[PDB]
Design an enzyme around this catalytic site. Structure first.
Site, mmCIF file in Angstrom:
data_model
loop_
_atom_site.group_PDB
_atom_site.id
_atom_site.type_symbol
_atom_site.label_atom_id
_atom_site.label_comp_id
_atom_site.label_asym_id
_atom_site.label_seq_id
_atom_site.Cartn_x
_atom_site.Cartn_y
_atom_site.Cartn_z
ATOM 1 N N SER C 140 0.640 -1.136 -0.273
ATOM 2 C CA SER C 140 -0.184 0.139 -0.097
ATOM 3 C C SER C 140 0.634 1.106 -0.048
ATOM 4 O O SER C 140 1.857 1.451 0.123
ATOM 5 C CB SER C 140 -1.229 0.398 0.953
ATOM 6 O OG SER C 140 0.020 0.695 2.474
ATOM 7 N N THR C 145 4.897 0.615 7.321
ATOM 8 C CA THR C 145 5.185 -0.675 6.598
ATOM 9 C C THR C 145 5.835 -0.327 5.413
ATOM 10 O O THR C 145 6.223 -0.239 4.315
ATOM 11 C CB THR C 145 4.768 -1.982 7.153
ATOM 12 O OG1 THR C 145 4.642 -1.165 8.391
ATOM 13 C CG2 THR C 145 5.769 -2.975 6.381
ATOM 14 N N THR C 179 -7.786 4.534 7.270
ATOM 15 C CA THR C 179 -8.350 4.832 8.608
ATOM 16 C C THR C 179 -6.876 6.074 9.677
ATOM 17 O O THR C 179 -6.852 6.138 10.183
ATOM 18 C CB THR C 179 -7.954 2.994 9.314
ATOM 19 O OG1 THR C 179 -9.157 3.523 10.678
ATOM 20 C CG2 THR C 179 -6.306 3.015 9.442
ATOM 21 N N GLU C 183 -1.979 9.987 4.783
ATOM 22 C CA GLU C 183 -1.628 8.584 3.474
ATOM 23 C C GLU C 183 -0.996 9.844 2.749
ATOM 24 O O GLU C 183 -0.132 8.956 2.038
ATOM 25 C CB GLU C 183 -2.579 8.134 3.455
ATOM 26 C CG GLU C 183 -2.851 6.772 4.540
ATOM 27 C CD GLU C 183 -3.972 5.829 4.462
ATOM 28 O OE1 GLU C 183 -4.368 5.481 2.945
ATOM 29 O OE2 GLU C 183 -5.135 5.473 4.493
ATOM 30 N N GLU C 254 9.502 -7.850 -20.827
ATOM 31 C CA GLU C 254 8.513 -7.568 -21.867
ATOM 32 C C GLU C 254 7.919 -6.641 -21.430
ATOM 33 O O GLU C 254 6.818 -6.507 -22.197
ATOM 34 C CB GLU C 254 7.727 -9.693 -22.287
ATOM 35 C CG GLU C 254 7.921 -8.576 -23.884
ATOM 36 C CD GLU C 254 7.335 -10.221 -24.050
ATOM 37 O OE1 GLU C 254 7.835 -11.021 -23.682
ATOM 38 O OE2 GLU C 254 6.198 -9.874 -25.152
HETATM 39 N N1 LIG Z 1 -7.381 -2.949 -1.031
HETATM 40 C C1 LIG Z 1 -7.026 -3.299 -0.055
HETATM 41 N N2 LIG Z 1 -6.447 -2.148 0.374
HETATM 42 C C2 LIG Z 1 -5.933 -2.322 1.747
HETATM 43 C C3 LIG Z 1 -5.737 -3.226 2.484
HETATM 44 N N3 LIG Z 1 -5.368 -3.422 3.971
HETATM 45 C C4 LIG Z 1 -4.785 -2.448 3.719
HETATM 46 N N4 LIG Z 1 -5.506 -1.357 2.547
HETATM 47 C C5 LIG Z 1 -5.475 0.270 2.489
HETATM 48 O O1 LIG Z 1 -3.653 0.142 3.468
HETATM 49 C C6 LIG Z 1 -3.555 1.378 3.327
HETATM 50 C C7 LIG Z 1 -3.271 1.340 4.983
HETATM 51 O O2 LIG Z 1 -2.005 0.737 4.843
HETATM 52 P P1 LIG Z 1 -1.719 -1.024 5.463
HETATM 53 O O3 LIG Z 1 -1.382 -1.521 4.208
HETATM 54 O O4 LIG Z 1 -2.626 -1.201 6.005
HETATM 55 O O5 LIG Z 1 -0.155 0.094 6.228
HETATM 56 P P2 LIG Z 1 0.522 -1.293 6.634
HETATM 57 O O6 LIG Z 1 1.488 -1.437 5.131
HETATM 58 O O7 LIG Z 1 0.450 -2.526 7.393
HETATM 59 O O8 LIG Z 1 1.624 -0.286 7.807
HETATM 60 P P3 LIG Z 1 1.523 0.113 9.014
HETATM 61 O O9 LIG Z 1 1.143 1.428 9.297
HETATM 62 O O10 LIG Z 1 2.721 -0.624 9.637
HETATM 63 O O11 LIG Z 1 0.934 -0.841 10.047
HETATM 64 C C8 LIG Z 1 -5.315 2.131 3.278
HETATM 65 O O12 LIG Z 1 -5.326 3.302 2.149
HETATM 66 C C9 LIG Z 1 -5.547 1.029 3.223
HETATM 67 O O13 LIG Z 1 -7.226 1.393 2.892
HETATM 68 C C10 LIG Z 1 -6.803 -4.551 2.272
HETATM 69 O O14 LIG Z 1 -6.295 -5.667 1.962
HETATM 70 N N5 LIG Z 1 -6.954 -4.269 0.529
HETATM 71 O O1 LIG Z 2 -6.623 4.288 21.466
HETATM 72 C C1 LIG Z 2 -7.915 4.888 22.745
HETATM 73 N N1 LIG Z 2 -8.827 5.474 22.098
HETATM 74 C C2 LIG Z 2 -9.053 4.783 20.332
HETATM 75 C C3 LIG Z 2 -10.162 4.535 19.332
HETATM 76 C C4 LIG Z 2 -10.492 4.635 18.399
HETATM 77 C C5 LIG Z 2 -8.795 4.252 17.770
HETATM 78 C C6 LIG Z 2 -8.098 3.971 18.604
HETATM 79 N N2 LIG Z 2 -6.604 3.202 17.757
HETATM 80 C C7 LIG Z 2 -5.950 3.433 16.434
HETATM 81 C C8 LIG Z 2 -6.673 4.317 15.447
HETATM 82 C C9 LIG Z 2 -6.024 4.001 14.379
HETATM 83 N N3 LIG Z 2 -6.983 5.171 13.199
HETATM 84 C C10 LIG Z 2 -8.219 6.261 13.832
HETATM 85 C C11 LIG Z 2 -7.286 7.158 13.214
HETATM 86 C C12 LIG Z 2 -8.714 8.652 14.277
HETATM 87 C C13 LIG Z 2 -9.708 7.987 14.354
HETATM 88 C C14 LIG Z 2 -9.365 6.932 14.232
HETATM 89 C C15 LIG Z 2 -11.447 6.636 14.332
HETATM 90 F F1 LIG Z 2 -12.270 5.374 13.707
HETATM 91 F F2 LIG Z 2 -11.498 6.029 16.259
HETATM 92 C C16 LIG Z 2 -9.311 5.562 13.739
HETATM 93 N N4 LIG Z 2 -5.646 2.847 13.687
HETATM 94 C C17 LIG Z 2 -5.448 2.122 14.994
HETATM 95 N N5 LIG Z 2 -5.360 2.673 15.296
HETATM 96 C C18 LIG Z 2 -7.414 3.607 20.038
HETATM 97 C C19 LIG Z 2 -7.437 5.775 24.055
HETATM 98 C C20 LIG Z 2 -6.516 6.530 24.479
HETATM 99 C C21 LIG Z 2 -7.146 5.136 25.536
HETATM 100 MG MG LIG Z 3 0.184 -3.265 9.824
#
Ligand SMILES: Nc1nc2c(ncn2[C@@H]2O[C@H](COP(=O)(O)OP(=O)(O)OP(=O)(O)O)[C@@H](O)[C@H]2O)c(=O)[nH]1
Ligand SMILES: O=C(Nc1cccc(Nc2cc(Nc3cccc(C(F)F)c3)ncn2)c1)C1CC1
Ligand SMILES: [Mg+2]
Ligand SMILES: Nc1nc2c(ncn2[C@@H]2O[C@H](COP(=O)(O)OP(=O)(O)O)[C@@H](O)[C@H]2O)c(=O)[nH]1
Ligand SMILES: [Ca+2]
Ligand SMILES: [Cl-]
Ligand SMILES: [Mg+2]
Lengths: 54, 424, 437, 346
Positions: C140, C145, C179, C183, C254
């Site tokens: 991605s 990562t 999420t 990005e 190719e």
């Molecule tokens: N099409 C598709 N998109 C994905 C999938 N999983 C994550 N994405 C997209 O990838 C982006 C998020 O990246 P990830 O692959 O989850 O991130 P990562 O490489 O695991 O890196 P970390 O931040 O370390 O967890 C977002 O735009 C997601 O919508 C998938 O299974 N299919």
């Molecule tokens: O941590 C706490 N609440 C908490 C609530 C929701 C998610 C997470 N953690 C995540 C959030 C994320 N993306 C993300 C970015 C912005 C907004 C949102 C929204 F969906 F919430 C999700 N991706 C992985 N993990 C943690 C409380 C202090 C205790």
């Molecule tokens: Mg990951």
């Protein structure tokens, strides 16, 4: 519109249709960058710890 | 994986005990620490907050701190009091008398290393410690002064783990003593520097919610703590249950905080529950969760701009409808979200609802309107400090007027920072 | 026979790899435990499927694959899922903490301490190769990562395998399914650091896959499972020419030659048709003309954009099923009269065509209907630069305010890498415009 | 409630459209760089079409057709007419035109091979040069190409209509301006009210440098002309006066003598580029208002001379024409809570 390099086999066939004719850094250079950002990191951590000691 | 929870002082320990009652009920764990629910989803991420002890019993990863033994004896005697590892109760005897200095520099200083010993013992027994959470008020002495003292100790020893606080801001309409604006100002300065997220829970806001919309005439500290524990459950629900988002601390921190110092969050809950049976529709939930009246910091969202927003829905409902309603909010009020952070409102869902609700929603806004809260404190502060009033309780513990002048300056700086981005 | 190695990096890379290898096993009749009854050369071979599988003594057919994530939870679902036996434990590499949506975290901080394990596992696969031609890298743009560790990997692979080809399958960020708000930073950063180590990259905008799953599959809120099974259809369509008998796109060289005349403009657009819902009660099968014509509907592209306002540099048509050349020629002729297809003056107006008579394989109980003929067009149109504009613009809005930069700088990155990558992107956009207008 | 954005403040027409849209009470204007809009009233140059149609939960419409400039720039239009089979080199309603680049593909070696056959056959041979100010109307080539080459832009030279229909009393030239609106559905809507941009000096067939006879432009007519305003207010005669004058002096109507040809030309040009600019299956939608400029000759044959992609309306007609844009281009896509257009179709 002439069809060229037609290849056929049991799995499929492929060809070409022409409608009209034509009108990297080293390993040391990378270990350097990685460890230089590691130095920026260890400096920032030192600044943090000196500040906490104050 | 693991989180370490700390609760410091009176308010800190009361809201923390309510938090543990609530989430213990959600994970089907009884006051003795034994599991008794139906779903396995209740136990899949149980070790995020509970340590597995012999007998498959679950013991909160919680450290209980006070400079006087009152509130913690009250906790050990209370509904879920026996769930907590008794080693994890760390108390001095003399109180802090609503004094930030006594919490930070003198009494708290004498107790802090033993609190850190327990923290360390809990940490080294973790596979993947992701960070810490603290519940405390900012208006008293142990909570604010010794809580921020702890926070900087923990940061020194664990500089790379996440630090979150759930911090009760003081209001004069719900006030113990007149020196709370001082204790909070000193604390905000620490908080702006050494935490990753701070959930600003204004006690005014809790009171207003209890009074106006819950028709509670005379709200107790209990009535306020119920709101807080429901809100904390909502914001930790994604950490505690498996879902399409493997939710952790750091990812929320990185995505919610565009600027390091601007990490003070407006929290909110919906529907607002007391101690009715009408079912909510997804548009209703969504409208309430963005309603100023459902937010726990007494700031007007319309007086600032959202930098980032996390919405969390709980229960079974149509994702399509959730997505439409979120989009309609952002698209019908797009002035109020900064355009220089595209798509700054992120939605998660948790399939398991809280106790007594089929649907609910939890809101975490990083809005510039929070500056209002800090202006209030600051006004209250200066009103006494321009006459050096009540300073003797602090200078008699070692502190200088210069330290007050600095904390005042830094909070005004934080207010300017929030203003900068409200007009950018 | 020359082997290809697939590297799947981060969540999206891993899960899409899952989809693709599930599909490949179905297409080559390989069971979940790795036995291929059709293979009569036991314990070895140089057939065309051996480009993607090796054989063991027990007749176990084993993906030339490596999976890499900086956290365990996803590859753990590989290590326990339907195809657990398929892969060898050393091929599945996980970390402890991920890059928390931070390019810097995956590239510099958490990457540095795992890059060598990864390169060693890749070398253990390469040493099993008699004539390795290079790598297919799935990742991605948005994850930490997926962006930072992939670009680190890409650099090191250029060093340790300078004469081999590297092809990307890229997932471009879509808010609906995203999420994280940073990005665009991660995307620009990684595009800039990978741009000279990638020979050809197939971008897939999750926005387009999402809406294809809504319109043509009638799924109201598509999951990653839906998106990934459709993505793997497209990816299989693109790699079939490496895994089957044929004369078009038979080695990674190719793909560059046929699709990338200018090595910086190396982002071909995929269009795919027909995508038909397995719940469709009555479906009139579509004709060679209908689906080739569908190839020029943007609603079927992996990236939403408008090839009419741009120029083509190459165009491949890959068919699967009941197709024969005269039908394809008729369809092309009649489409050319009714559509705006302009090439760059220094390229032939034409199509390289590949037919494989076996119709697309569909996962049982998936969302895709069986059809009797399908096609993936690969067109190197300058119109894809639209996506870049979008991305760049989003990036500019945040970076004007230094929003979130502290998170990156705090991991060792310097602020200047940001505007270095943005200036590379600006050069890229201007390349596209000079080629295309 | 809908949301829209303005990115061209020098647009008279879409200024009035913003006004009407606000007065509806159901449309609110965001700041120019807010992305969460339904309607973009965009800029004339480098409108960012690649950013439209990517906002979930929003239907986006724009007041321009990406690609329409091929019709709305002079060399673009000459190349379109000569290379489009739908129009043809042998176009009976576009004046003989050649695209010529400065000294600093070109058609002047093609141009001479027709010019000198015009001179030898003893035919009238006046040509006019222009680039999308700087006009030369001459009888021999070495003035035209000389002049084109003094400038530095791509140019076109066109057979100058030496025998135009002349309006009496006055013996004076005019051009027709028709306003056409093309909605998202590619309905072509010709507006009921066109205008005559007239001259006020008597067409002098002798020396083609007196700019006021030969150039109908509203500005060159207000400034340097003797009798600006003698016959009609603003050098602007409208369609009822023109119908009446055709009826009285010529015993025809505007419909039969001129408007059939105008409708045919408009529909032919728009349908010609339809497969290239239509937003029928796109992720965003386009509409656009065009201004078409015509010249009637003495035999009552209508000629097309330019299409303009951002036209200015006549001040008498702003109200009605902008209201019609709202009704059929905007409210068709975004519904609120005896038409002034003729649909062209065949
Ligand atoms: N099409 C598709 N998109 C994905 C999938 N999983 C994550 N994405 C997209 O990838 C982006 C998020 O990246 P990830 O692959 O989850 O991130 P990562 O490489 O695991 O890196 P970390 O931040 O370390 O967890 C977002 O735009 C997601 O919508 C998938 O299974 N299919
Ligand atoms: O941590 C706490 N609440 C908490 C609530 C929701 C998610 C997470 N953690 C995540 C959030 C994320 N993306 C993300 C970015 C912005 C907004 C949102 C929204 F969906 F919430 C999700 N991706 C992985 N993990 C943690 C409380 C202090 C205790
Ligand atoms: Mg990951
Ligand atoms: N919401 C809430 N606020 C409290 C509670 N107890 C005290 N406070 C507030 O906390 C401040 C007093 O702090 P307290 O916790 O007693 O100080 P400490 O024991 O020295 O840390 C005042 O602003 C009180 O309004 C409680 O149970 N709930
Ligand atoms: Ca074999
Ligand atoms: Cl090599
Ligand atoms: Mg107290």
């Amino acid at each position: 519109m002439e069809v060229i390099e037609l290849n056929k086999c049991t799995s499929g066939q492929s060809f070409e249709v022409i409608l009209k004719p034509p009108s990297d850094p080293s390993l040391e250079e990378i270990q350097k960058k990685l460890e230089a950002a590691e130095e920026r990191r260890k400096y920032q951590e030192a600044e943090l710890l000196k500040h906490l000691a104050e | 994986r693991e989180i370490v929870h700390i609760q410091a002082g009176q308010c800190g320990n009361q809201i923390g005990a309510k938090f543990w009652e609530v989430i213990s009920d959600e994970h089907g764990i009884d006051p003795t620490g034994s599991y008794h629910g139906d779903s396995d989803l209740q136990l899949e991420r149980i070790n995020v907050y509970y340590n597995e002890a012999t007998g498959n019993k679950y013991v909160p990863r919680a450290i209980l701190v006070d400079l006087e033994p009152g509130t913690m004896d009250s906790v050990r005697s209370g509904p879920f009091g026996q769930i907590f590892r008794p080693d994890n109760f760390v108390f001095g005897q003399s109180g802090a008398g609503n004094n930030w200095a006594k919490g930070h520099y003198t009494e708290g200083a004498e107790l802090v290393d033993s609190v850190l010993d327990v923290v360390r013992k809990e940490s080294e027994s973790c596979d993947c410690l992701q960070g810490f959470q603290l519940t405390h008020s900012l208006g008293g002495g142990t909570g604010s002064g010794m809580g921020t003292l702890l926070i900087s100790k923990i940061r020194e020893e664990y500089p790379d783990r996440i630090m979150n606080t759930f911090s009760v801001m003081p209001s004069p309409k719900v006030s113990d003593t007149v020196v709370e604006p001082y204790n909070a100002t000193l604390s905000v300065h620490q908080l702006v520097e050494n935490t990753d997220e701070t959930y600003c829970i204004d006690n005014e806001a809790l009171y207003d919610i209890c009074f106006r919309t819950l028709k509670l005439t005379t709200p107790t500290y209990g009535d306020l703590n119920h709101l807080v524990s429901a809100t904390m459950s909502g914001v930790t629900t994604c950490l505690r249950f498996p879902g399409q988002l493997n939710a952790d601390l750091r990812k929320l921190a990185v995505n919610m905080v565009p600027f390091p110092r601007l990490h003070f969050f407006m929290p909110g809950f919906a529907p607002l529950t007391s101690r009715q049976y009408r079912a909510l529709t997804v548009p209703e939930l969504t409208q309430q969760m963005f309603d100023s009246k459902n937010m726990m910091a007494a700031c007007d969202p319309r007086h600032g701009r959202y930098l980032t927003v996390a919405a969390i829905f709980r229960g079974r409902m149509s994702m399509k409808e959730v997505d439409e309603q979120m989009l309609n909010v952002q698209n019908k009020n797009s002035s109020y979200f900064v355009e220089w952070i595209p798509n700054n409102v992120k939605t998660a869902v948790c399939d398991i609802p809280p106790r007594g609700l089929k649907m609910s929603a939890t809101f975490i806004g990083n809005s510039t309107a929070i500056q209002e809260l800090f202006k209030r404190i600051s006004e209250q502060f200066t009103a006494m400090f321009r006459r050096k009033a009540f300073l003797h309780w602090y200078t008699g513990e070692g502190m200088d007027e210069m330290e007050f002048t600095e904390a005042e300056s830094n909070m005004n700086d934080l207010v300017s920072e929030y203003q900068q981005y409200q007009d950018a | 026979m020359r082997e290809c190695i697939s590297i799947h990096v981060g969540q999206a890379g891993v899960q899409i790899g899952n989809a693709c290898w599930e599909l490949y096993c179905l297409e080559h009749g390989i069971q979940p435990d790795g036995q291929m009854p059709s293979d009569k050369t036991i314990g070895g071979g140089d057939d065309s499927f051996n480009t993607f599988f090796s054989e063991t003594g027990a007749g176990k057919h084993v993906p030339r694959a490596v999976f890499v994530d900086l956290e365990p939870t996803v590859i753990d679902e590989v290590r326990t899922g339907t195809y657990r036996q398929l892969f060898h434990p050393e091929q599945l590499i996980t970390g402890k903490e991920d890059a928390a949506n931070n390019y810097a975290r995956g590239h510099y901080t958490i990457g540095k301490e795992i890059i060598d394990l990864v390169l060693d596992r890749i070398r253990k696969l390469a040493d099993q190769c008699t004539g390795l031609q290079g790598f297919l890298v799935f990742h991605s743009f948005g994850g930490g990562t997926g962006s930072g560790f992939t670009s680190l990997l890409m650099e090191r692979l250029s060093v340790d395998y300078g004469k081999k080809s590297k092809l990307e399958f890229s997932i471009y960020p879509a808010p609906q399914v995203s999420t994280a708000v940073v990005e665009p930073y991660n995307s620009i950063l990684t595009t800039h650091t990978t741009l000279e180590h990638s020979d050809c990259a197939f971008m897939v905008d999750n926005e387009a896959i999402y809406d294809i799953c809504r319109r043509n599959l009638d799924i109201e809120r598509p999951t990653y499972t839906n998106l990934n099974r459709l993505i793997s259809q497209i990816v299989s369509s693109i790699t079939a020419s490496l895994r089957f008998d044929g004369a078009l796109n038979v080695d990674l060289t190719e793909f560059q030659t046929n699709l990338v005349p200018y090595p910086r403009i190396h982002f071909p657009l995929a269009t795919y048709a027909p995508v038909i819902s397995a719940e469709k009660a009555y479906h009139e099968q579509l004709s060679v003309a209908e689906i080739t014509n569908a190839c020029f509907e943007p609603a079927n592209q992996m990236v939403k954009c408008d090839p009419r306002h741009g120029k083509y540099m190459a165009c491949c048509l890959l068919y699967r099923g009941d197709v024969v050349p005269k039908d394809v020629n008729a369809a092309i002729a009649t489409i050319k009269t009714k559509r705006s297809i302009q090439f760059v003056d220094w390229c032939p107006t034409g199509f390289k065509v590949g037919i494989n008579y076996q119709p697309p394989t569909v996962v049982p109980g998936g969302d895709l209907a069986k059809v009797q003929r399908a096609v993936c067009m690969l067109s190197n149109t300058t119109a894809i630069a639209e996506a870049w504009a979008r991305l760049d613009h989003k990036f500019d809005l945040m970076y004007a305010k230094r929003a979130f930069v502290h998170w990156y700088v705090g991991e060792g990155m310097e602020e200047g890498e940001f505007s270095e990558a943005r200036e590379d992107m600006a050069a890229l956009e201007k390349d596209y415009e000079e080629v295309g207008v | 409630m809908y949301t829209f954005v303005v990115r061209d403040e020098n647009s008279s027409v879409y200024a009035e459209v913003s006004r009407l849209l606000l007065a509806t009470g159901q449309w609110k204007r965001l700041r120019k760089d807010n992305p969460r809009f339904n309607l973009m009233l965009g800029e004339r140059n480098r409108l960012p079409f690649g950013r439209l149609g990517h906002e979930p939960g929003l239907v986006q419409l724009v007041n321009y057709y990406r690609g329409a400039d091929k019709l709305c720039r002079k060399a673009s239009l000459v190349k379109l007419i000569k290379t489009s089979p739908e129009l043809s080199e042998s176009c009976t309603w576009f004046p003989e035109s050649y695209v010529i680049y400065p000294t600093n593909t070109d058609e002047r070696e093609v141009f001479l091979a027709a010019y000198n056959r015009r001179r030898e056959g003893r035919e009238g041979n006046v040509w006019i040069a222009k680039s999308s100010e700087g006009i030369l109307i001459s009888s021999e080539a070495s003035e035209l190409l000389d002049f084109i080459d003094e400038q530095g832009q791509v140019h076109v030279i066109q057979k100058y209509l030496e025998k135009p229909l002349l309006l009496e009393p006055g013996h004076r030239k005019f051009d027709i301006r028709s306003w056409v609106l093309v909605d998202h559905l590619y309905n072509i809507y010709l507006y009921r009210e066109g205008v005559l941009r007239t001259s006020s000096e008597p067409y002098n067939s002798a020396n083609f440098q007196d700019k006021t006879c030969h150039l109908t432009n509203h500005c060159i007519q207000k400034e340097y002309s003797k009798n600006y305003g003698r016959y009609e207010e603003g050098n602007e005669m409208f369609f009822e006066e023109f119908n009446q004058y055709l009826m009285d002096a010529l015993n025809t109507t505007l419909e039969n003598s001129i408007l059939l040809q105008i409708k045919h030309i408009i529909r032919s040009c728009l349908m010609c580029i339809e497969p290239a600019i239509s937003t029928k299956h796109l992720h965003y939608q386009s509409f656009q208002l065009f201004g078409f400029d015509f010249m009637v000759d003495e035999e009552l044959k209508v000629w097309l001379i330019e299409v303009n992609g951002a036209p200015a309306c006549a001040q008498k007609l702003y109200a009605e024409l902008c209201q019609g844009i709202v009704d059929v281009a905007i409210s068709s896509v975004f519904p609120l809570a005896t038409s002034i257009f003729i649909k062209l179709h065949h």
